[PDB]
Amino acid sequence: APWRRVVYRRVDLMEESNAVLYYPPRPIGDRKNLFSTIFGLINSNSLDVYEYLDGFEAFTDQYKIKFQEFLDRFGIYYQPSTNKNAELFKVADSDIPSAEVKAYYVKEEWYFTPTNSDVDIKIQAICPIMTGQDEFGEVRNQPLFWIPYENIRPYIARERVMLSSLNNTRNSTIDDFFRLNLYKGDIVKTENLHN
Amino acid sequence: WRRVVYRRVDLMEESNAVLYYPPRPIGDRKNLFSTIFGLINSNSLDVYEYLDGFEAFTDQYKIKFQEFLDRFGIYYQPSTNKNAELFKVADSDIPSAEVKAYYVKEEWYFTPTNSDVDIKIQAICPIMTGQDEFGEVRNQPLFWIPYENIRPYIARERVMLSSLNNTRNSTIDDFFRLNLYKGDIVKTE
């Protein structure tokens, strides 16, 4: 009787509708983009992120990202932290690949409501995709990790963003952008859920 | 004296086709990736995480086979004999046909003899080409194999080479040790 599916969408930050998640490419003054926010939150032990696996998502302790391994894997320069409670490592903004994350994978869950006869679309998780040259000169698109939407929601609910579709209200947040499905992207995968 | 050189070895090229031969195990004949995969599954080979910028052959970066299978979407089932294999993996799900290149890490020794450049293989990295869960075709370095770890096994793997006038005594170890592979330098340290 219940009718559910999982939909994965590729959200390109170069498109006007999604540009809000990219500006500024590197932090300027008080403003930073979504990736710079995410990176800062992982470094401050405020956000649990999970390994990108090809074919499924597992938000378990086994697949929880080991931040140092992540930094070493993607060649991000770091130094020891002078206060382990504030940050796991000392990482300068210029070494953070916030300008290189030009797309996100967005996992949604579609739920049929019996009484309403309508379908509810709810964001479940997001995955930043980094574009850049590897150590061997190859340009690669690399999904970095999965962020369960519940983990990031308290922080993006406190991040104000201007949206032309919302007539540039100063009350809209990044959480509103995702919850209200204001992002645009193509469906890259679908999975029917079998209860 | 020493210098680290990385070479991309394309398995499609005639000179390197011997490492790709056959794309999947034809009865008893298996290619280099199939041998590697089989040894990791039988707990006979230690392989290490591919890191962008450096190689660390330490316990911290040792590949965990199940995590590797999950990460690269290789279908597996529980093993019926844990002593022979960690997991039951069908040949069609083993990406032996999708590994069409390797990164080869070389140590160059130079001397004061003259310009003796002696090239010693240090490690190899299979590169898998294929579509991910989201339809994107990607080139993915899988892991680093220290050459010493694989050497005793590929020293027992016979291969026919036209450059060696098809002797039945040449091994895959000879192919690597004698620098019979061909490829472009992609990085120098």
DSSP assignment of B111-129: -SSSS-EEEEEEEEEEEEE
What distance in Å separates the CA atoms of residue A110 and residue A108, rounded to the nearest whole number?
Answer: 7
Three-state secondary structure call for residue A159: coil
For β-strands A119-133 and B87-88, DSSP reports them as unpaired
Size of interface A-B (CB pairs under 8 A): 56
Residue reference for tokens 């074919």 = A55
Q: How far apart are CA A45 and CA A68, in angstroms?
A: 12
What's the token pair of residue A28? 């300027």
Nearest to B125 by CA among B34, B13, B48: B48
What is the C-alpha to C-alpha distance for residues A77 and A91, in angstroms, rounded to an integer?
7
Length of chain B measured in residues = 189
Distance CA B67, CA A64 (A): 12
Contact between A189 and B70 using a beta-carbon 8 Å cutoff: no
User: How close is the nearest chain B Cα to the Cα of A73, in Å?
Assistant: 4
Q: Give me the residue label for tokens 């696996």.
A: A53
Local structure of A129: helix, strand or coil: strand
Three-state DSSP class for B138?
strand
Q: What gap in Å lies between CA B69 and CA B86, rounded to an integer?
A: 11
Cα angle, residue B87 at apex, residues B35 and A190 outer, rounded to 5°: 105
Show the tokens assigned to A57: 């998502």
Q: How far apart (Å, rounded) are the C-alpha atoms in residues A2 and A193?
A: 9
Cα–Cα distance measured from residue B161 to residue B175, given in angstroms and rounded to the nearest whole number: 9
CA dihedral of residues B36, B23, B183, B39 (deg, nearest 10): 0
Q: How far, CA to CA in Å, does A164 sit from each of A24, A105, B49? A: 17, 23, 45
Distance in angstroms (rounded) separating the CA atoms of residues B75 and A55: 10
Contact assessment for residue B145 and residue B125, using Cβ atoms and an 8 Å cutoff: yes
Could you say which of B61, B133, B139 has the minimum Cβ distance to residue A138?
B139
The shortest C-alpha distance from A7 to chain B (Å) reads 11
B150 neighbors B172 (Cβ within 8 angstroms)? no
Q: Are A177 and A163 in contact (CB under 8 A)?
A: yes
Contact (Cβ atoms closer than 8 angstroms) between residue A38 and residue A146: no
Report the distance separating Cα A74 and Cα A145, nearest Å. 12
User: Is-contact A34 A26, C-beta < 8 A?
Assistant: no
Nearest-5° Cα angle at B145, B140 to B148:
165
Cβ neighbours around A101 below 10 Å, total: 25
Which one, of A97, A50, A101, lies nearest residue A78 by Cα? A97
Which tokens go with B174? Answer: 């000879």
* Chain centre distance of CA A78: 22
CB contact under 8 A, A54 and B133: yes
Q: CA A145, CA A64: separation in Å to the nearest integer?
A: 9
Per the structure block, which two tokens stand in for A129? 């995709």
Per-residue tokens: B62: 């040792």
Q: Which residues contact A194 (CB under 8 A, 6 or more apart)?
A: none
Amino acid occupying residue B161: L
Which residues of chain B does A56 touch, with a Cβ-Cβ cutoff of 8 Å?
70
8 Å CB contact between A10 and A185:
yes
Name the region of B7 (left: φ>0; alpha: ψ -120 to 50; beta: rest): beta
> Is the distance from CB of B72 to CB of B127 less than 8 angstroms?
no
- To one decimal, the resolution in angstroms is 2.0
Whether residue B52 and residue A74 make contact (CB cut-off 8 A), yes or no, is yes
Helix (H, G, I), strand (E, B) or coil at A167: coil
- For residue A189, the distance in angstroms to the closest alpha carbon of chain B comes to 6
- Angle of helix B32-41 relative to helix B147-154, nearest 10 degrees, comes to 110
Geometric angle at alpha carbon A35, from A97 and B127, rounded to 5°: 50
User: What is the end-to-end Cα distance of chain B in Å, rounded?
Assistant: 13
Q: B87-88 and B77-78: which strand pairing?
A: antiparallel
**Min Cα–Cα distance to chain A from B48, Å:** 12
Cβ density class B123-137: b for 16+ within 10 Å, e for less: bbbbbbebebbbeee
B126 in Cβ contact with B142 (< 8 Å): yes
Residues A51, B71: C-beta atoms closer than 8 Å: yes
Which residues lie across from B121 on neighbouring strands?
B106
Does the distance separating the beta carbons of B51 and A136 come in below 8 Å? Answer: no
Q: For B6, which residue in chain A has the nearest alpha carbon?
A: A136
Q: Is the dihedral of CA A27, A29, A34, A38 positive or negative?
A: positive
